[PDB]
Structure 1
């Protein structure tokens, strides 16, 4: 895969990447969580699936949910970005999803 070598003007990127562990909990709630991702407590007990999706945003309380410990799921351009990430431009309006694979 080759991309046009122009420098893009995206605002930022969101990459729903699963993370955290019992002894090292992430901060999030079911609302702000990502669809396709599942969230568990310190004991590995299921709690909920992410309720939002990159495209089309919605409002969530900005507090960490004590019940959740972990989850399981600038020149960068849409072609240059990574699939599994959603890029937005200024005034964060959705633009595209990455097309490249993460380096190995």
Structure 2
């Protein structure tokens, strides 16, 4: 699966567990990126960025 965390994932993208539980929406703005810890959260398995 993917390797990201809620901090580093992108605003506009939702991150989910392998069972389909919504974990968080990403917090980073591609244009004005914030500093985040760089581990892979064990709970996020995939994401969907609704369009």
Task: Check whether TM > 0.5.
Answer: yes
- TM-score scaled to structure 1, two decimals? 0.46
Q: Identify which of 46, 56, 61 aligns with 2:37.
A: 61
> What SS is found at the alignment partner of 1:31?
coil
1:36 aligns with 2:6: no
Taking structure 2 as the reference length, what is the TM-score of the superposition?
Answer: 0.91
- Give the Cα separation in 1 of the matches to 2:6 and 2:23: 8
Q: Extract unaligned runs of 5+ from structure 1.
A: 1-24, 74-104
Higher-Rg structure is 1
What aligned pairs does 1:1-104 form with structure 2 within 5 A after superposition?
Answer: 25-73=1-49
Equivalenced residues, count: 49
Please list the CA deviations of residues 56-96 of structure 1 after superposition, one character each: whole Å capped at 9, or x if unmatched: 111111100001000000xxxxxxxxxxxxxxxxxxxxxxx
Detail structure 1 runs of 4+ shifted over 2 Å in the superposition: none
Higher relative contact order (CA 8 A, sep 6+): 2
Structure 2 gaps, min length 5: none
Distance in 1 (alpha carbons) for counterparts of 2:33 and 2:18: 28
Within 2, Cα distance between the matches of 1:26 and 1:47?
Answer: 14
